[PDB]
Amino acid sequence: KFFSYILVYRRFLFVVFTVLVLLPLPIVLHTKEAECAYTLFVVATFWLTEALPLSVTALLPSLMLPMFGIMPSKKVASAYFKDFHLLLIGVICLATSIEKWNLHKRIALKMVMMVGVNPAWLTLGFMSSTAFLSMWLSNTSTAAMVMPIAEAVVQQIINATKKGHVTRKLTCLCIAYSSTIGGLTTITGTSTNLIFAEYFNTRYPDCRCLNFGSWFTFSFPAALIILLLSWIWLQWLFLGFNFKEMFKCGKTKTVQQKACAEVIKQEYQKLGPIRYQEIVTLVLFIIMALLWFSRDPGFVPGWSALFSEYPGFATDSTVALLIGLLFFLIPAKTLEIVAFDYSPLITWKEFQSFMPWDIAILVGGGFALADGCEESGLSKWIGNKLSPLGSLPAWLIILISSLMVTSLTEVASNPATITLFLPILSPLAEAIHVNPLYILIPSTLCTSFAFLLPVANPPNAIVFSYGHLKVIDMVKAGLGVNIVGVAVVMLGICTWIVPMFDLYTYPSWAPA
Amino acid sequence: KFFSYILVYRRFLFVVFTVLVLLPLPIVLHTKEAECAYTLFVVATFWLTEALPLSVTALLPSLMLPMFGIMPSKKVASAYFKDFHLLLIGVICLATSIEKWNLHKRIALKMVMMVGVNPAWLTLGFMSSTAFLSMWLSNTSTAAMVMPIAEAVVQQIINATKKGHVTRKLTCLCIAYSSTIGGLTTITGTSTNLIFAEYFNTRYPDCRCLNFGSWFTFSFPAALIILLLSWIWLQWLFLGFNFKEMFKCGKTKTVQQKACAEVIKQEYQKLGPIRYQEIVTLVLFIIMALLWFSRDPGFVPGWSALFSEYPGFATDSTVALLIGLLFFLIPAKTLEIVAFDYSPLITWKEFQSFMPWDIAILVGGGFALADGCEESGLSKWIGNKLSPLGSLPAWLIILISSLMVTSLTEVASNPATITLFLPILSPLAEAIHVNPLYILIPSTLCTSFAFLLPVANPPNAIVFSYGHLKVIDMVKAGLGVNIVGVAVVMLGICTWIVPMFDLYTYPSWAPA
Ligand code: NA
Numbered sequence A, B: 001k002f003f004s005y006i007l008v009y010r011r012f013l014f015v016v017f018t019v020l021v022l023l024p025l026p027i028v029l030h031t032k033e034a035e036c037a038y039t040l041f042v043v044a045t046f047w048l049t050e051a052l053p054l055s056v057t058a059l060l061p062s063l064m065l066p067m068f069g070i071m072p073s074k075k076v077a078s079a080y081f082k083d084f085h086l087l088l089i090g091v092i093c094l095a096t097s098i099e100k101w102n103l104h105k106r107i108a109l110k111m112v113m114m115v116g117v118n119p120a121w122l123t124l125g126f127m128s129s130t131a132f133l134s135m136w137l138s139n140t141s142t143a144a145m146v147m148p149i150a151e152a153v154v155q156q157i158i159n160a161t162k163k164g165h166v167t168r169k170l171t172c173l174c175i176a177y178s179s180t181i182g183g184l185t186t187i188t189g190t191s192t193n194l195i196f197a198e199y200f201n202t203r204y205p206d207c208r209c210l211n212f213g214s215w216f217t218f219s220f221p222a223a224l225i226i227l228l229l230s231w232i233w234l235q236w237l238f239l240g241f242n243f244k245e246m247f248k249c250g251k252t253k254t255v256q257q258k259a260c261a262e263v264i265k266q267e268y269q270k271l272g273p274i275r276y277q278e279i280v281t282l283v284l285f286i287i288m289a290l291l292w293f294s295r296d297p298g299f300v301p302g303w304s305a306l307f308s309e310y311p312g313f314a315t316d317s318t319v320a321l322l323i324g325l326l327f328f329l330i331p332a333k334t335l336e337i338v339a340f341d342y343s344p345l346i347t348w349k350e351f352q353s354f355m356p357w358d359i360a361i362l363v364g365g366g367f368a369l370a371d372g373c374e375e376s377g378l379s380k381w382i383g384n385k386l387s388p389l390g391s392l393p394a395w396l397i398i399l400i401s402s403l404m405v406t407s408l409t410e411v412a413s414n415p416a417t418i419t420l421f422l423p424i425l426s427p428l429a430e431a432i433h434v435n436p437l438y439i440l441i442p443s444t445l446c447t448s449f450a451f452l453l454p455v456a457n458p459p460n461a462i463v464f465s466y467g468h469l470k471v472i473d474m475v476k477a478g479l480g481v482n483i484v485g486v487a488v489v490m491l492g493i494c495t496w497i498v499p500m501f502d503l504y505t506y507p508s509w510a511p512a
């Protein structure tokens, strides 16, 4: 009966065993580096294994670093909140306004009406729309908004079962992948890009090459190539390739295709005419995008010139918060008195939901762990021990680092992997006498390449929650898309990334 | 029809008018102090008038200070999270564990069985129990936990209607007041005390007089006197004073009294025997309290001696987080496989609720506004302009400051009032050449004295939400209890506060 008892309480016993077996490392080394390494190993073990919720393991550093004497609790608490959180609040307000008034339904239905009911073109339409939507919103929020809509659309198309099951698997997987693919494009698209940008700006304040325009101009071609290749791979793997009737215009449509078009048109008509709340939300979203462009792109710094007395004070989070708080003020619904006043188009009770407080805590914990790693001296020791590896040719170092980051991001969340690997790859970066961007950009791009397992990133879990998918087919599709993404990233780094960032030579802003 | 339109959209028009009319202040003064004053006035206006949710107004500083050029957005974002938030997370985990397993029901019912059904003694029992519970938990959480239980108890007593209505009004008000009264006792009892402690430690790192033991030893007598006086005042105002049958032991109980005792005993028996989850929660709560005592009290620094190499690194938030994360790990419910593993006695989905994210954002915004006030130079200018007030005798200055804080905390929340007044009262404190504690302690004690209106503090709103109360009776009771509290605070400051803090003379740690 002991075996049953130890098997049932696996998580608690594993937590205790992990805490105890690694305890000799700080018990006998008498160094701050050993204690920080113990904290890092415990946190990474609980993130990869998922013995505890990710937010609890994120709160562990604020519990472990002060007691080890590495850094005061005030400093850790300050590190638990950063600029990324303000931008997250603004974007979450925008996404709540979009979801609440069914703007995404209108966009998706107009998209489906424009594209058609041809399954290959239809899946391409969902991938493009989800990528464009995730270009500004977070990948998790974008997937959560788009998955129910596309699921209902494909169910309606099928109704008007092996083929339908394959089609719904394909649409689920393409939504899950396209969310991340679109998130790659911009700094604000996903949390991983934000973490990388914050870390790069803090560690190298001198460097200023990472702007929104530069990030878009070196990420959009690669992301577009990966999107097209992933669409082709998915439609070949699941639906099968029938180009003869695909590219040729089917003017004489079959009865079932025209029935599907008619039922989609009926659904759109049932959705109703565009309302004023949706117009206000769309206008505010467009203003957000235009002002994110408007900060210094290198052509005309329209927004940054007005504030050319205090540079760096106002950032993308400032405009994000501006529009998000505007969403808290514009009247939407008036009101036999019926409470007199209006409704602010977003109530704080609605923003309390739709808001990833767990993700905020997780990112704060990762930032606190990274800061403790820098302060305790662990990063310097890792760089010193990894210095002899610098004699090896650089391109293989980038290849290996990207491969390890990709492999370890299937089991750990993207913020977890990026927060674990930035303080390891950076000291390696200036230990070799190589440009830090040359190693960091491929790693932060490949961190998002998490497609094998539903627990890899939240979008995959959200998509898998519908039950149409199976783990093995998801593994096949993830392997294909991951190979495509890694190949495209390597091709970009070799060919067109280096002309603009001058990655071949060592930069001035990097330490000597 | 214009009048109806302008009256319906009062909040939006008022927000726009407040933003625009105060705009000339930063438009033409060409100083950072004026810009920070504009930010402060806008935030205070929206906090007092409730034109926007308190959290939105708390997010406003992170929008205004960076664009005004006062301080970078990174610094503001760092200021939105502090040691207060870690301690809040730990205490909220503890409170969630207590609520989920109905430990508070057992405690309250055992209390009712012990005290009896005599209405005066019964209301005293609820006041004492709520004060003791709020001595560790937050006032809002304590009120939210105790209000339904006591409401059900008094309804059951009445069932076994003017007299009942008066009794339920009395018990509602006694719970609402006793929550705050108990919160006064300890640093961790309420948010205001924690904010004051953080501000005092940051502004005066040299001073170390504010420990948990010192705070208890100068707050418990005053809080106890105020509690007894408030109980007497409430029972005289609502129930009426009948001492002849009150203090004398009614051994020959009335039929309705014994029926009420029997029905309470039946309710307790229906509650069931004490479970293992409740025992674990109680043990962890007791450990929290004992370790809060165990940090340096001045007698034996048992917890601080072990860490006597890195002083101040591990604080009460460390033990709070320790116990809170322990609540995330101990198994409670096992599991025809039924999901194999156990339940961690608190799921993160439950901690996402029960957690005041709005309060966390509000406190962060107040801290950011205070930091901007210190950095922009507004506090120095206020101190310079308030220096001529120092010729007036000190005791009257403390009296006026306490009266202003008490008056303004009836309309504004306690964290808002304390965050607005600490950066005003401190520079006034060292501008006069008087001990800063001499002014700050009465003000931070009287900030909690918010009893007049339901919007004064969250416990009042929670209590008023049941609908038994009316605004005018609440105003009368609040005036009585507020006069009692102010008188007791003044008596303490005059008589027994000064021997231990040496408030009569100027301290060394205060600036010259
Ligand atoms: Na991942």
Ligand code: NA
Pocket (backbone or CB within 6 Å): B409, B410, B411, B412, B413, B414, B417, B447, B450, B455, B456, B457
């Ligand atoms: Na108040």
